[PDB]
Tab-separated table of C-alpha atoms and ligand atoms in Angstrom:
chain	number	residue	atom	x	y	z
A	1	UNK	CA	11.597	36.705	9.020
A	2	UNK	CA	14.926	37.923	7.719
A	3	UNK	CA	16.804	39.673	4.862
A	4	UNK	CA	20.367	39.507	3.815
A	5	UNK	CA	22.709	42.048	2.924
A	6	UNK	CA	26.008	41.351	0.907
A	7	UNK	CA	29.358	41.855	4.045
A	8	UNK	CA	32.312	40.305	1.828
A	9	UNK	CA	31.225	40.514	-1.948
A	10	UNK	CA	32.154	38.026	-4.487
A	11	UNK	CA	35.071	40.343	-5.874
A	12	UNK	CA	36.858	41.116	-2.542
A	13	UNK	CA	37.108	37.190	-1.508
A	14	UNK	CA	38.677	35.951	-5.472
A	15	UNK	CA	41.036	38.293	-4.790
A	16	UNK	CA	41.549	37.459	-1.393
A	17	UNK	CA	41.894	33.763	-2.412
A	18	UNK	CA	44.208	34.544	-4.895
A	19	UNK	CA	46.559	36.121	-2.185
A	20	UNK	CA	46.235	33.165	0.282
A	21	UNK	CA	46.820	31.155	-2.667
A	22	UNK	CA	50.639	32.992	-3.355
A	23	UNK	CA	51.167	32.293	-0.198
A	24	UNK	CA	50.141	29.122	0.720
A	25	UNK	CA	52.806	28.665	-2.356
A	26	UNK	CA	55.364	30.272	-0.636
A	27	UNK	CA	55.337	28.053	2.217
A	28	UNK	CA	54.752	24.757	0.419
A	29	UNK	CA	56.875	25.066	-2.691
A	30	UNK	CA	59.829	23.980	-1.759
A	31	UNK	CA	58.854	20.682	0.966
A	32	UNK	CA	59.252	18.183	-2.110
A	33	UNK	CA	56.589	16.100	0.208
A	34	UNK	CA	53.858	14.823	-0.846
A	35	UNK	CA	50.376	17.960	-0.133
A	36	UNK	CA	47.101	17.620	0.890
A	37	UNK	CA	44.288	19.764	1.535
A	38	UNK	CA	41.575	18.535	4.136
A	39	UNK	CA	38.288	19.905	3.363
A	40	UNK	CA	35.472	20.267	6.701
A	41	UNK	CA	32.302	19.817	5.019
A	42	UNK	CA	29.937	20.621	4.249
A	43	UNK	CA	31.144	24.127	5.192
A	44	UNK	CA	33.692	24.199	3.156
A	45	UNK	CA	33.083	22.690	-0.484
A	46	UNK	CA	32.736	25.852	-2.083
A	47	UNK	CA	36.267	27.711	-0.303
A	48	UNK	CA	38.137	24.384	-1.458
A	49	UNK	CA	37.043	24.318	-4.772
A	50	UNK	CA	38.578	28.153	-5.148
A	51	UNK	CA	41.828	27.404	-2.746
A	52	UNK	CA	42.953	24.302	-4.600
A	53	UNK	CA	42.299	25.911	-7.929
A	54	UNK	CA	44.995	28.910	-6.284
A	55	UNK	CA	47.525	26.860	-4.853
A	56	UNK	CA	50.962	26.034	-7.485
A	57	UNK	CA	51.759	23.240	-6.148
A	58	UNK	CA	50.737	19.082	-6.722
A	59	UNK	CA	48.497	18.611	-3.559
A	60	UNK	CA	45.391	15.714	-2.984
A	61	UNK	CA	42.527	16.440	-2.007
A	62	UNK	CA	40.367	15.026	0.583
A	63	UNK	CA	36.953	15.737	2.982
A	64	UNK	CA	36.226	15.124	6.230
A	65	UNK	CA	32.919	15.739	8.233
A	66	UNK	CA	33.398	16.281	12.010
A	67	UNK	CA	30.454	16.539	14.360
A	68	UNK	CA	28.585	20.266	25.673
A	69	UNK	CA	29.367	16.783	23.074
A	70	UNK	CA	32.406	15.282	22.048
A	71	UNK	CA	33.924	16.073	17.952
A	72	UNK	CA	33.516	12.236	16.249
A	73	UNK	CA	34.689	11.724	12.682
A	74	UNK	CA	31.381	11.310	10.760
A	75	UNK	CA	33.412	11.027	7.795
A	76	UNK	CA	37.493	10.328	7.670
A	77	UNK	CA	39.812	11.037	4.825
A	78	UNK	CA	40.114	8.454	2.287
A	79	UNK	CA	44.040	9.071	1.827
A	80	UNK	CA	47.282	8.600	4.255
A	81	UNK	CA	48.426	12.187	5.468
A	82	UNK	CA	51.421	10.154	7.774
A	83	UNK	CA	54.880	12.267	6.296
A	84	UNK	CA	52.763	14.794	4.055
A	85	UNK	CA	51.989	18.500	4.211
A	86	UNK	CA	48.467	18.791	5.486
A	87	UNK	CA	46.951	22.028	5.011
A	88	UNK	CA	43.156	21.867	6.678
A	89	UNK	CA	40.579	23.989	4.873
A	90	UNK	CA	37.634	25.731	6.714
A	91	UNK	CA	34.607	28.443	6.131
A	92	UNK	CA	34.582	30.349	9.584
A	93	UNK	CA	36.929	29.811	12.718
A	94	UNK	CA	34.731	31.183	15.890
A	95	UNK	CA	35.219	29.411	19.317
A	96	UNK	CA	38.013	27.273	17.832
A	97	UNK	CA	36.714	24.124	19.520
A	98	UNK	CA	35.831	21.730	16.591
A	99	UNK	CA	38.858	23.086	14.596
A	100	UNK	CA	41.253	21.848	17.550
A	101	UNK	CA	39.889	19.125	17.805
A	102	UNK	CA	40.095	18.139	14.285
A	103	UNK	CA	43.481	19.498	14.201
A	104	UNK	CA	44.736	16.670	17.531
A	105	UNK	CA	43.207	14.005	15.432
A	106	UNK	CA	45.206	14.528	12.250
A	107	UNK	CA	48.176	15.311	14.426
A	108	UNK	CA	48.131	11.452	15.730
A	109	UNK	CA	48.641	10.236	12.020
A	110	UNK	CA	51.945	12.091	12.110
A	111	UNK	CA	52.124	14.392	9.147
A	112	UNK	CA	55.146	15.708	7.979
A	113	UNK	CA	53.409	19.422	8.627
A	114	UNK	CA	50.402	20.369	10.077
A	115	UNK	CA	48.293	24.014	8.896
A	116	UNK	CA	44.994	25.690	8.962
A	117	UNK	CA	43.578	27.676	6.968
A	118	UNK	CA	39.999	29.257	7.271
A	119	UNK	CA	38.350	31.763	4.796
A	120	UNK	CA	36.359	33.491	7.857
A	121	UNK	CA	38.077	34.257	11.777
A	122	UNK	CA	35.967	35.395	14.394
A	123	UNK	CA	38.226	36.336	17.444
A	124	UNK	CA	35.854	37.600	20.081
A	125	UNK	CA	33.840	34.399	19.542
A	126	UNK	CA	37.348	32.044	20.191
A	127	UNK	CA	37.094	30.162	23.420
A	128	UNK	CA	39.955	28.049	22.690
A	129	UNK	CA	44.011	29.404	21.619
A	130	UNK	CA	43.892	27.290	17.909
A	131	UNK	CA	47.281	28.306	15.759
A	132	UNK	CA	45.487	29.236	12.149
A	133	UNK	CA	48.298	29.960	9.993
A	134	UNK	CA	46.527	31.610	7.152
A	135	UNK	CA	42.988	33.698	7.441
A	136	UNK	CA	40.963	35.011	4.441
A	137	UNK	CA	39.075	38.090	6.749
A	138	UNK	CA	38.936	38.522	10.344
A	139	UNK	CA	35.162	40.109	10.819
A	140	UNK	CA	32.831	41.080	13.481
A	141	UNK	CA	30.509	38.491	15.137
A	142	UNK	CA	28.249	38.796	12.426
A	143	UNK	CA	25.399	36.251	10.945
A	144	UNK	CA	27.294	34.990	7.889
A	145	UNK	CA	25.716	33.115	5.098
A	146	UNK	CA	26.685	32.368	1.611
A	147	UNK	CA	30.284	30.794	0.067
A	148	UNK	CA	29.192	27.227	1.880
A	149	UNK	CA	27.569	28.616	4.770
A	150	UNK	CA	24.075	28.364	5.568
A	151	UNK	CA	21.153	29.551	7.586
A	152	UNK	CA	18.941	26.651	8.258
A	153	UNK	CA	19.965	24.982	5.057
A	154	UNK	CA	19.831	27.926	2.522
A	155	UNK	CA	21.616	30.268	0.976
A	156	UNK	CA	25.458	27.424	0.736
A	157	UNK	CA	25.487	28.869	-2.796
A	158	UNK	CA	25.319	32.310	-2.624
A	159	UNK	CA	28.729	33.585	-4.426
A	160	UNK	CA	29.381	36.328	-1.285
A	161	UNK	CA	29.640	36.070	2.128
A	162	UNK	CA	26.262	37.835	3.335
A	163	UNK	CA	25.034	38.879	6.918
A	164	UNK	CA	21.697	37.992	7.840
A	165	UNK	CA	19.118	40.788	9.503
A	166	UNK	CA	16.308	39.994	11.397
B	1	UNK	CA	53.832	6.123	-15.255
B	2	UNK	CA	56.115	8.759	-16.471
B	3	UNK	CA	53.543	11.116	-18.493
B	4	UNK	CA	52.943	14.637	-19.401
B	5	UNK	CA	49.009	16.847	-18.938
B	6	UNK	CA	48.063	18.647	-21.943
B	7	UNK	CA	45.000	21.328	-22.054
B	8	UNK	CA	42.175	20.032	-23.428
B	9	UNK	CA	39.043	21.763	-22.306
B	10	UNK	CA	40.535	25.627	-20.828
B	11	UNK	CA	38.901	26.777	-17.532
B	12	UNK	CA	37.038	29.923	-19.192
B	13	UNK	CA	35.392	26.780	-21.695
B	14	UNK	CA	34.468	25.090	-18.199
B	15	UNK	CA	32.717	28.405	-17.292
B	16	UNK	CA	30.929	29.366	-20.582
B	17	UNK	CA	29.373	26.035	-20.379
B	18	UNK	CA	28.636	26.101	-16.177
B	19	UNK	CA	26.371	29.666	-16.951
B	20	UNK	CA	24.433	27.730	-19.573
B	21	UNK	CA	23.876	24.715	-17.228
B	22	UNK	CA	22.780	26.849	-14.534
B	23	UNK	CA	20.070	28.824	-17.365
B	24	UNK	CA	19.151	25.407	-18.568
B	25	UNK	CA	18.810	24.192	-14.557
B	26	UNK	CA	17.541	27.518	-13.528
B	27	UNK	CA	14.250	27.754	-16.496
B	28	UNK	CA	13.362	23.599	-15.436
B	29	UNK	CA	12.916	24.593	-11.843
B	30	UNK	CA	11.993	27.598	-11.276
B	31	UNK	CA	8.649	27.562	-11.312
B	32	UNK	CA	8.209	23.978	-9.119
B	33	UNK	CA	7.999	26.095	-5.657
B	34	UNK	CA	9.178	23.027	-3.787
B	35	UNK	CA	12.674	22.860	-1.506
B	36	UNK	CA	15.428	21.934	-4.586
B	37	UNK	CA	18.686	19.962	-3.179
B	38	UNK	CA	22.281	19.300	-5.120
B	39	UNK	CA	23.657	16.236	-4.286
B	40	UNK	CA	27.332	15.922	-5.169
B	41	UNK	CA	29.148	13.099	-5.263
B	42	UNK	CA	32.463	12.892	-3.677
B	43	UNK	CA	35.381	13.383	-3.995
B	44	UNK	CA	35.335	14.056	-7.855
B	45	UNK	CA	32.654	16.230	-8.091
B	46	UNK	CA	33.172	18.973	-5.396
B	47	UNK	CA	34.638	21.581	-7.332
B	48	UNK	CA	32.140	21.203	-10.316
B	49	UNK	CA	29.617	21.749	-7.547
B	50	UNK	CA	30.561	24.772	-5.808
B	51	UNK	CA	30.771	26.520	-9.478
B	52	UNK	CA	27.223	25.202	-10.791
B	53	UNK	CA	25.550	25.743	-7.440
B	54	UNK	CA	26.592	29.457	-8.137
B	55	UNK	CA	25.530	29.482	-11.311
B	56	UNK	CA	21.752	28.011	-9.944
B	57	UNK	CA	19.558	30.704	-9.858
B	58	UNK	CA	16.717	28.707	-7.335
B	59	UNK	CA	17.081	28.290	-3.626
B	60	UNK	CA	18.578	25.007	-3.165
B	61	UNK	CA	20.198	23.208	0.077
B	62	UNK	CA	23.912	21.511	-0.929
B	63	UNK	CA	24.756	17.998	0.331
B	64	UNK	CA	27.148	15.604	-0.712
B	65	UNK	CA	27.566	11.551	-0.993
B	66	UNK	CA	30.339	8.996	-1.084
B	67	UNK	CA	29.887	5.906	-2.785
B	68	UNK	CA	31.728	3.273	-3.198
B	69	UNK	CA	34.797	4.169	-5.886
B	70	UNK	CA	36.277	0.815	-5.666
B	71	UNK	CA	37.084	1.861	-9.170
B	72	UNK	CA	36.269	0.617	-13.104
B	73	UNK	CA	31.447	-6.042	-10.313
B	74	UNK	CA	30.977	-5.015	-6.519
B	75	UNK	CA	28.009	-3.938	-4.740
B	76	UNK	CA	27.984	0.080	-5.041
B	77	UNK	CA	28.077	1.089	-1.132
B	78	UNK	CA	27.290	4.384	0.813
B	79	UNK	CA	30.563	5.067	2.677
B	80	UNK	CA	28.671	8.748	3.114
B	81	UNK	CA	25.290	9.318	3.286
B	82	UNK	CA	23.118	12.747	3.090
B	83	UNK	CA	22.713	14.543	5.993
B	84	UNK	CA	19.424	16.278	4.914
B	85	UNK	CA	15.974	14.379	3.905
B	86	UNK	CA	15.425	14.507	0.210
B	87	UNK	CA	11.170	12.841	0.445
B	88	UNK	CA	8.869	15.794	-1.674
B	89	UNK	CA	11.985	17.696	-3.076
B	90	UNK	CA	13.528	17.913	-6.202
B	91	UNK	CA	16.834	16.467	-6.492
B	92	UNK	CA	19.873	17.308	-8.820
B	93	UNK	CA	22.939	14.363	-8.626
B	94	UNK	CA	25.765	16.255	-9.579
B	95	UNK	CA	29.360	14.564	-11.292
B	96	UNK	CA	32.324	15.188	-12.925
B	97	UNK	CA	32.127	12.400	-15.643
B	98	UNK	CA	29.559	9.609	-16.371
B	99	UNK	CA	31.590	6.912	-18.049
B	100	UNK	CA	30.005	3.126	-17.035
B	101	UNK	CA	27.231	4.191	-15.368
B	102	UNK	CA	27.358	2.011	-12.744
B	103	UNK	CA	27.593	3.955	-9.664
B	104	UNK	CA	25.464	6.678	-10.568
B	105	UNK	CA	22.734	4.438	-11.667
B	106	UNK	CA	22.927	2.500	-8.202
B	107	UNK	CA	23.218	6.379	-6.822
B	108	UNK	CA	19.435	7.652	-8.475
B	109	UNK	CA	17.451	4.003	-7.480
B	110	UNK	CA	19.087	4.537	-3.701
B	111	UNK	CA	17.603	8.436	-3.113
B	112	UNK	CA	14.647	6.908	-5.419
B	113	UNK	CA	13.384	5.220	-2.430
B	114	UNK	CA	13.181	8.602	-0.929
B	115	UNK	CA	10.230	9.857	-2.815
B	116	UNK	CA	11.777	12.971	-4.175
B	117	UNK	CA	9.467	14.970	-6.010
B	118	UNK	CA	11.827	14.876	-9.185
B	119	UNK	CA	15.375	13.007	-9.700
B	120	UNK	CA	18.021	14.434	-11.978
B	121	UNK	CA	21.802	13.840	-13.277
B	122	UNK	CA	23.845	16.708	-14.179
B	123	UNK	CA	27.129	15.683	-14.993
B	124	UNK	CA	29.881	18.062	-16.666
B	125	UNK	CA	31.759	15.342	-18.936
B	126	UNK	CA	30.304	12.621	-20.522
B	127	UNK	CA	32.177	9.302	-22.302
B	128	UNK	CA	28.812	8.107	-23.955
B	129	UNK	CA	31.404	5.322	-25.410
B	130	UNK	CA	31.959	3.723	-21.957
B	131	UNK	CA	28.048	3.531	-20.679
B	132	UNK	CA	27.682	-0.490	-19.840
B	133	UNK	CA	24.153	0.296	-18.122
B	134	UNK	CA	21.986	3.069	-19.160
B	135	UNK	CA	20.769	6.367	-17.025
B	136	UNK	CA	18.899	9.232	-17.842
B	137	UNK	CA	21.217	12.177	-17.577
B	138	UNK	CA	19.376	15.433	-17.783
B	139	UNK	CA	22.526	18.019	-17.643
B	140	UNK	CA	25.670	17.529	-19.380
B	141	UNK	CA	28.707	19.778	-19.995
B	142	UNK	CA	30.902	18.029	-22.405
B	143	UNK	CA	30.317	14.746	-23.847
B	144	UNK	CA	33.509	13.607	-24.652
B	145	UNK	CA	35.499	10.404	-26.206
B	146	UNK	CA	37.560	7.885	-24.266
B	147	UNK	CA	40.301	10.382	-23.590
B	148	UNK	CA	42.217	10.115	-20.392
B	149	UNK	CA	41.105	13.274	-18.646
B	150	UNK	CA	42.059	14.890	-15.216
B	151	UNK	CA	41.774	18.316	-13.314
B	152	UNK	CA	38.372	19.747	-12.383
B	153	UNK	CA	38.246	17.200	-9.711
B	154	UNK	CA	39.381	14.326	-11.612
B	155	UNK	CA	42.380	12.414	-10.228
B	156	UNK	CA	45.273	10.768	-12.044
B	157	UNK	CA	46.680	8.287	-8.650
B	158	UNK	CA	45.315	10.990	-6.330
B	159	UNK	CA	46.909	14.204	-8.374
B	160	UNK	CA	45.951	17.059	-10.698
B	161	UNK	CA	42.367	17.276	-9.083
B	162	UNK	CA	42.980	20.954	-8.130
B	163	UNK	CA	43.928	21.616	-11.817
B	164	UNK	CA	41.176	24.388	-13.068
B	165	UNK	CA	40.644	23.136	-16.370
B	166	UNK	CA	40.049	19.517	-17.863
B	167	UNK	CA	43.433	18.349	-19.217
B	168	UNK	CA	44.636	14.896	-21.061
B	169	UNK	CA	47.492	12.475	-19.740
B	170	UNK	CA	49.823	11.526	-21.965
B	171	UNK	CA	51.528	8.136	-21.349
B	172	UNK	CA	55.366	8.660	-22.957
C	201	MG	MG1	35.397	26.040	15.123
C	202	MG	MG1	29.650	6.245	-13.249
């Protein structure tokens, strides 16, 4: 028994996206090496969709779904990343652990590069130091919802980042 | 191949027509008052998703499927399945182009054998030229000739899928 209230709206994040867009950019433009972004999903559909649409430079794109338990590969990329610019693209960042993880596992196919970038940081929830090289909005340890995140499978489409209030 | 792209249907068309799939999608399920679910299919139709879901006016779970994109005689192949139960809900398939068929087709008998309560195609282009087995397909954006399209999630050997609007390749 809950209600949401809007935290990020839909206005604040476009232009936030276009700004990590310049500057993913920046750092990229001038490799010459081949790009990819690496999608988490399902979390992350809906941040990917507006990131790759920002980013001015050829890049693939590709999705991968990672799981007290060990992170297993669910579903791998279905493209090489050995010698390219891998940019990884996730909703939230919170105790880090899945994230660096994911991160060790790309890192053994030897890109060229190796990046994160998450829309959503949550540093007193990190349990784990994880370089993320690019961050949409550090926030409070809020209930999120809303731009691919849910609350027991609702709300993924939501065009804001909400809060939920019990 | 050395080529050129060329802009063939602009991003703000692409949006015009994603609010009027999402009134169309909104007014046929409003009213069922059971659990709706998208089901994209990966990769090509992820960005075509995250706009339409947006544009969905019904709560809905998101979920995703690969199949097998051997490309365009093979058995069609979950590499990907759901990870949420689909039995007494109604279902939208969302993709970026239906061209053959064959996949999406093999896609709706598959989540068939779910029970949904209702099963659905919403596609945003569609090559009616190319169909070699026939599908219902409720929703569609553009229907299209045999042009060689990218962008919007469409790949030309694993580029311009970021490209915001739908563009043609031009073969020099
Ligand atoms: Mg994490
Ligand atoms: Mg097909």
């Amino acid at each position: 028994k809950h209600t949401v209230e809007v935290m990020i709206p839909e206005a604040e994040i476009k232009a936030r996206i276009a700004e990590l867009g310049r500057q993913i950019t920046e750092r990229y433009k001038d490799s010459g090496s081949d790009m990819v972004l690496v999608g988490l999903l399902r979390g992350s559909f809906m941040f990917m969709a507006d990131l790759c649409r920002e980013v001015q430079v050829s890049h693939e794109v590709d999705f991968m779904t990672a799981s007290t338990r060990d992170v297993k590969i669910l579903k791998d990329l279905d493209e090489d990343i050995r010698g390219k610019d891998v940019l990884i693209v996730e909703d939230i960042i919170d105790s880090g652990n899945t994230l660096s993880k994911v991160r060790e596992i790309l890192s053994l196919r030897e890109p060229k590069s190796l990046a994160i970038c998450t829309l959503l940081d949550k540093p007193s929830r990190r349990e784990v130091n994880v370089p993320v090289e690019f961050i949409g909005f550090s926030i409070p340890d809020e209930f999120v919802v809303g731009y691919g995140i849910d609350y027991a499978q609702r709300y993924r489409h939501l065009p804001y980042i909400g809060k939920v209030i019990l």
